[PDB]
Design an enzyme around this catalytic site. Structure first.
Site, PDB file in Angstrom:
ATOM      1  N   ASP A  57      67.903  17.254 -36.367  1.00 49.98           N
ATOM      2  CA  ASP A  57      67.013  16.276 -35.792  1.00 49.98           C
ATOM      3  C   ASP A  57      66.415  15.446 -36.931  1.00 49.98           C
ATOM      4  OD1 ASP A  57      64.012  15.604 -34.888  1.00 49.98           O
ATOM      5  OD2 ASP A  57      65.325  15.670 -33.134  1.00 49.98           O
ATOM      6  N   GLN A  61      60.578  16.121 -34.352  1.00 45.26           N
ATOM      7  CA  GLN A  61      59.958  16.087 -33.041  1.00 45.26           C
ATOM      8  C   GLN A  61      61.034  16.315 -31.987  1.00 45.26           C
ATOM      9  OE1 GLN A  61      57.376  12.647 -32.346  1.00 45.26           O
ATOM     10  NE2 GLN A  61      56.938  12.551 -34.579  1.00 45.26           N
ATOM     11  N   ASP A 138      62.834  35.880 -20.169  1.00 46.75           N
ATOM     12  CA  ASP A 138      63.516  37.152 -19.809  1.00 46.75           C
ATOM     13  C   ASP A 138      65.003  37.018 -19.998  1.00 46.75           C
ATOM     14  OD1 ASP A 138      63.890  35.527 -17.481  1.00 46.75           O
ATOM     15  OD2 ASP A 138      63.011  36.999 -16.102  1.00 46.75           O
ATOM     16  N   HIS A 142      66.962  39.304 -22.516  1.00 42.83           N
ATOM     17  CA  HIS A 142      68.071  40.045 -21.896  1.00 42.83           C
ATOM     18  C   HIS A 142      69.253  39.895 -22.821  1.00 42.83           C
ATOM     19  CE1 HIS A 142      70.657  41.283 -18.330  1.00 42.83           C
ATOM     20  NE2 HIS A 142      71.573  40.728 -19.097  1.00 42.83           N
ATOM     21  N   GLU A 143      69.566  38.634 -23.253  1.00 48.00           N
ATOM     22  CA  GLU A 143      70.777  38.446 -24.067  1.00 48.00           C
ATOM     23  C   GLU A 143      70.649  39.086 -25.452  1.00 48.00           C
ATOM     24  OE1 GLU A 143      73.254  37.754 -22.506  1.00 48.00           O
ATOM     25  OE2 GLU A 143      72.506  36.643 -20.732  1.00 48.00           O
ATOM     26  N   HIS A 146      71.342  42.700 -25.413  1.00 46.26           N
ATOM     27  CA  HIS A 146      72.736  43.145 -25.463  1.00 46.26           C
ATOM     28  C   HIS A 146      73.149  43.382 -26.917  1.00 46.26           C
ATOM     29  CE1 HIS A 146      73.999  43.138 -21.323  1.00 46.26           C
ATOM     30  NE2 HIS A 146      73.755  41.840 -21.094  1.00 46.26           N
ATOM     31  N   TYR A 157      80.853  48.408 -21.344  1.00 41.18           N
ATOM     32  CA  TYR A 157      80.416  47.503 -20.284  1.00 41.18           C
ATOM     33  C   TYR A 157      81.269  47.627 -19.028  1.00 41.18           C
ATOM     34  CZ  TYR A 157      77.797  43.289 -18.877  1.00 41.18           C
ATOM     35  OH  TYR A 157      76.938  42.393 -18.290  1.00 41.18           O
ATOM     36  N   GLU A 166      73.360  46.890 -18.697  1.00 44.51           N
ATOM     37  CA  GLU A 166      72.664  45.834 -17.977  1.00 44.51           C
ATOM     38  C   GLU A 166      71.168  46.087 -17.745  1.00 44.51           C
ATOM     39  OE1 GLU A 166      72.891  42.651 -16.673  1.00 44.51           O
ATOM     40  OE2 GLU A 166      74.286  42.753 -18.345  1.00 44.51           O
ATOM     41  N   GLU A 177      58.972  39.444 -21.701  1.00 42.91           N
ATOM     42  CA  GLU A 177      58.221  38.490 -20.868  1.00 42.91           C
ATOM     43  C   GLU A 177      56.754  38.926 -20.722  1.00 42.91           C
ATOM     44  OE1 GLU A 177      60.226  36.828 -17.358  1.00 42.91           O
ATOM     45  OE2 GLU A 177      58.355  37.282 -16.194  1.00 42.91           O
ATOM     46  N   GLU A 190      63.572  34.045 -12.835  1.00 41.86           N
ATOM     47  CA  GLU A 190      62.837  33.176 -11.934  1.00 41.86           C
ATOM     48  C   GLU A 190      62.453  31.861 -12.545  1.00 41.86           C
ATOM     49  OE1 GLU A 190      61.690  36.062 -13.242  1.00 41.86           O
ATOM     50  OE2 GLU A 190      60.129  35.267 -14.523  1.00 41.86           O
ATOM     51  N   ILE A 197      63.702  25.995  -4.793  1.00 45.43           N
ATOM     52  CA  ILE A 197      63.222  27.142  -4.028  1.00 45.43           C
ATOM     53  C   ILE A 197      62.190  27.968  -4.776  1.00 45.43           C
ATOM     54  CG2 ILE A 197      63.820  29.279  -2.872  1.00 45.43           C
ATOM     55  CD1 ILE A 197      66.818  28.143  -2.708  1.00 45.43           C
ATOM     56  N   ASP A 226      82.991  42.821 -10.909  1.00 43.63           N
ATOM     57  CA  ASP A 226      81.860  42.810 -11.819  1.00 43.63           C
ATOM     58  C   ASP A 226      81.891  44.012 -12.753  1.00 43.63           C
ATOM     59  OD1 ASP A 226      79.298  42.047 -12.901  1.00 43.63           O
ATOM     60  OD2 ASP A 226      78.259  43.260 -11.431  1.00 43.63           O
ATOM     61  N   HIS A 231      76.158  44.468 -12.811  1.00 41.24           N
ATOM     62  CA  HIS A 231      74.955  43.729 -12.447  1.00 41.24           C
ATOM     63  C   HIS A 231      74.438  44.105 -11.075  1.00 41.24           C
ATOM     64  CE1 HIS A 231      75.635  40.863 -15.781  1.00 41.24           C
ATOM     65  NE2 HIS A 231      76.912  41.044 -15.442  1.00 41.24           N
TER      66      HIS A 231
END
Ligand SMILES: O=C(O)CCNC(=O)c1ccccc1
Ligand SMILES: [Ca+2]
Ligand SMILES: [Ca+2]
Ligand SMILES: [Ca+2]
Ligand SMILES: [Ca+2]
Ligand SMILES: [Zn+2]
EC number: 3.4.24.27
Length: 316
Positions: A57, A61, A138, A142-143, A146, A157, A166, A177, A190, A197, A226, A231
């Protein structure tokens, strides 16, 4: 890159202003030298080549809409580093301050995020199912978790070990979080899911069944989708974790909550000292009980509550 440490300012995916640690050498790069061997954030430029280019950048900014996913990937990787260091005395994901790399703008309309064995990767979403996924702390945590699992227990996995992999990422995604303490909850994703929604999420730890995931071993998925339900069956363990922290009565079995910090200490110790690549759910129960025994004593409330929680989800 070699340069001098600087402090940029920008807005994240949800429109919040935050400061970010950068590095100056002709451009300002998303390179935070203040944490371990660095946190490095890259632009994948809507392609699928990784990592892409270290984010550059001109003026330090980062208020452009295109900048927002990078600001949040970079900043939330920092928060997650701080959680592991300050709460668990763990230096980065390998325990030895490995550089943390993230790429944003991966692919086009990509409704997901992942750890590819070497770095975190975030789609932008399609704007309907998801907005840019690094907007969820989160998800980022989460990542990164792993990577912690891969360097520690190494849970394969697939099938039950994969559902534990997981759930460990959902558990520590959630504890990060809460650590950051901005609208924390026991839901996953979320902040970036379905902008049209309110009040939904991709998974729930408090009530996995809200999104079709099992909350008892008798409801486990045994098909092949999966990776054998990693998951899906993670709901059984996520529910157990939620009950250990928060308490509750589930299918008639009451659990005395012991709170998030003790949940984190017990599962961090299980992850790093007892779980193995092929651990199943029964073995996780034994690892958590032993971890709680090491920390609190065999006759402790903590041990009793771990047992109650796994009893409540049908795991012996
Ligand atoms: O397991 C993974 O890391 C890949 C699948 N993605 C998720 O689990 C996810 C979590 C929160 C928000 C969006 C996606
Ligand atoms: Ca700029
Ligand atoms: Ca939240
Ligand atoms: Ca959440
Ligand atoms: Ca939503
Ligand atoms: Zn995952």
């Amino acid at each position: 890159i070699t340069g001098t440490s600087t402090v940029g300012v920008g807005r994240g995916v949800l429109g919040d202003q935050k400061n970010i640690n950068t590095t100056y050498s002709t451009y300002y790069y998303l390179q935070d030298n203040t944490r371990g061997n660095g946190i490095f954030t890259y632009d994948a430029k809507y392609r699928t080549t990784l990592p892409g280019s270290l984010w550059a950048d001109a003026d330090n900014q980062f208020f452009a809409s295109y900048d927002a996913p990078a600001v949040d990937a970079h900043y939330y990787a920092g928060v997650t580093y701080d959680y592991y260091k300050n709460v668990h005395n763990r230096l980065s994901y390998d325990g030895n301050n490995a550089a943390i790399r993230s790429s944003v703008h991966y692919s086009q309309g990509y409704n997901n995020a992942f750890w590819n064995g070497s770095q975190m990767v975030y789609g932008d979403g399609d704007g309907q199912t998801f907005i840019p996924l690094s907007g969820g702390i989160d998800v980022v945590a989460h990542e990164l978790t792993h990577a912690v699992t891969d360097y520690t227990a190494g849970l394969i996995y697939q099938n039950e070990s994969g559902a534990i992999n997981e759930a460990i990422s959902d558990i520590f995604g959630t504890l990060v979080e809460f650590y950051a303490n901005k609208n924390p909850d026991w839901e996953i994703g979320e902040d970036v899911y379905t902008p049209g929604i309110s009040g939904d999420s991709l998974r729930s730890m408090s009530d996995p069944a809200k999104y079709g995931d099992p909350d008892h071993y008798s409801k486990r998925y045994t098909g092949t989708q999966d990776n054998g339900g990693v998951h899906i069956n993670s709901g059984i363990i996520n529910k157990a974790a939620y009950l250990i922290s928060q308490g509750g009565t589930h299918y008639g079995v009451s659990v005395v909550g012991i709170g998030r910090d003790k949940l984190g200490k017990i599962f961090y110790r299980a992850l790093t000292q007892y779980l193995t690549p092929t651990s199943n759910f029964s073995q996780l129960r034994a690892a958590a009980v032993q971890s709680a025994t090491d920390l609190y004593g065999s006759t402790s409330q903590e041990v009793a509550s771990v047992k109650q929680a796994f009893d409540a989800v049908g795991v012996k």
